[PDB]
Copies of this chain bind each other. A is one copy, B any other.
Amino acid sequence: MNYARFITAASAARNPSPIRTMTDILSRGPKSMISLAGGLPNPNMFPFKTAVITVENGKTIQFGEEMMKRALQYSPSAGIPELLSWLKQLQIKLHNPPTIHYPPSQGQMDLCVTSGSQQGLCKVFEMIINPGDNVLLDEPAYSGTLQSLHPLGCNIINVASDESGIVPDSLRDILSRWKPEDAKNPQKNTPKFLYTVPNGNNPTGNSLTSERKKEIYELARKYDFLIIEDDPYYFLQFNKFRVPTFLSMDVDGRVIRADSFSKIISSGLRIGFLTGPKPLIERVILHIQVSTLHPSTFNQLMISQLLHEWGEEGFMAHVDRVIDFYSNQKDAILAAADKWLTGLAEWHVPAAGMFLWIKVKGINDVKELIEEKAVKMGVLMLPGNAFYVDSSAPSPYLRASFSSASPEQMDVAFQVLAQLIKESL
């Protein structure tokens, strides 16, 4: 409703970078006209000439001479138009956001392709946070998010969470520190946003329920804060009826969503995208315009041509193949845990994602148990300390990945782990 409340002075001060202003009046109008105004290098000098990329369950992708020249040249900061248009239709199909036809100033849905979803998130955090600002999130959280927020000088207020994600009652009690009208008061420092990973949180594997999302959204309206929906495992849910997203219920235009292709299409190509209210997305684009400029044109065209030949049907079929693999991996690590860790640890079944979150009984810090008996016993898992703001506190938790291990390796790994628990206890 008043987006200036969520934009720093520095972010609001950004102005558009003109690599389109004079290259603008060239297509339409006088088609026979000469322009010595662009800042583009001559692509005929570039050494790569054609490309052929094979695809499993898809048509081979080919860049001919002219397409290769485009792939090797600058492109628009928000992304190439055919990828933006395909992704916009995907978001309408999956989430039907209420904001599609809003006026720009009151939150019209807008998309920005980013160089990985984390780039979008980082520039969103930078857009909003002044030192001393209060922000809300649930621990344990992705260590990369915690390391991104740390230098911004915000106070991170932990919201309680359980096996169904954020607990609305905890959020409501935290917010009772303020009155709703304090959000309009410059002195009061009400929280600027709530950040969460609603599906398959890294490291816990837990996901929010539909009922809790509705409750949380009502609190976000009442105290007027944004919801940053960081959803990189949205396409890795094992339920296969997906819970409606915050974006799908965002009648106010207060949700910024980050989607990722890193887990289903490619992490190395560095292509994700943000969806959110136009005034906030515009601030991110302007920051991109003076940093990365745009995501790799080559990699966007690879993905765009894949997605267009797949169609939404082929995309969802690919998603379902990937879910099938990870769900079988999940069953396998749960079976190994059932056999070897029962009575020595506790865990919840992951609802989505790639990780199993294991609490060891009768030990206060597993960092000693793991890092010390590592090279020794030949097994390695990740201590949970890194997923809390205070990583120095002791943690009895371990994060175990099931993305790659074979059932044999899982059995060996947990056999070894079980013996150390019984020796250290």
- Hey, which bits of chain A sit against chain B, CB under 8 A? 10-11, 13-19, 22, 25-26, 29-30, 32-42, 45-58, 61, 70-75, 115-116, 118-119, 122-123, 143-144, 147-148, 150-153, 202, 262-270, 289-299, 302, 306, 318, 321-322, 325-326, 329, 333, 354, 374-375, 378-382, 386, 399-405, 409-410, 412-413, 416
Contact = CB atoms under 8 A, between A and B. Distances in A.
Given A151-B13, A267-B72, A37 B401 contact: yes
B325 A296 contact: no
B45 A325 contact: yes
Contacts of A354: 39, 41
A40 B71 CA distance: 27
A49 B55 contact: yes
A119 B115 CA distance: 11
A133 B30 CA distance: 47
B382 A37 contact: yes
Contacts of A326: 42
Contact of A72 (B58, B147, B268): B268
Contacts of A416: 34
B268 A325 contact: no
Contact of A413 (B34, B45, B151, B292): B34
B401 A38 contact: yes
Contact of A53 (B14, B50, B119): B50
Contact of A116 (B51, B54, B202, B293): B293
A34, A115, A318: residue with the most chain B Cβ atoms closer than 10 Å: A34
Given A270-B294, A375-B29, A47 B265 contact: yes
Contact of A49 (B54, B295, B318, B386): B54
Given A13-B151, A34-B380, A36-B381, 16 more contacts: A10-B153, A14-B151, A36-B400, A37-B380, A37-B401, A39-B401, A41-B262, A41-B354, A47-B58, A49-B54, A51-B52, A115-B115, A116-B293, A147-B290, A269-B296, A269-B298
A399 B37 CA distance: 7
A13 B153 CA distance: 9
Contacts of A72: 266-269
A133 B302 CA distance: 43
Q: What are the 8 A-B residue pairs with the smallest beta carbon separation, nearest first?
A: A268-B297, A33-B378, A148-B290, A35-B380, A122-B291, A37-B382, A13-B151, A72-B266
A290 B58 contact: no
A424 to B, nearest CB: 18
A313 to B, nearest CB: 15
A417 to B, nearest CB: 9
B25 A380 contact: yes
A22 B122 contact: no
Given A42-B325, A150-B15, A290-B122, A71 B268 contact: yes
B292 A116 contact: yes
Indicate the member of A22, A55, A289, A326 with the most B CB atoms within 10 Å: A22
A33 B375 CA distance: 8
Contacts of A266: 46, 48, 72-73, 298
A405 B322 CA distance: 49
A24 to B, nearest CB: 10
Given A71-B268, A150-B15, A292-B119, A55 B47 contact: yes
A327 to B, nearest CB: 12
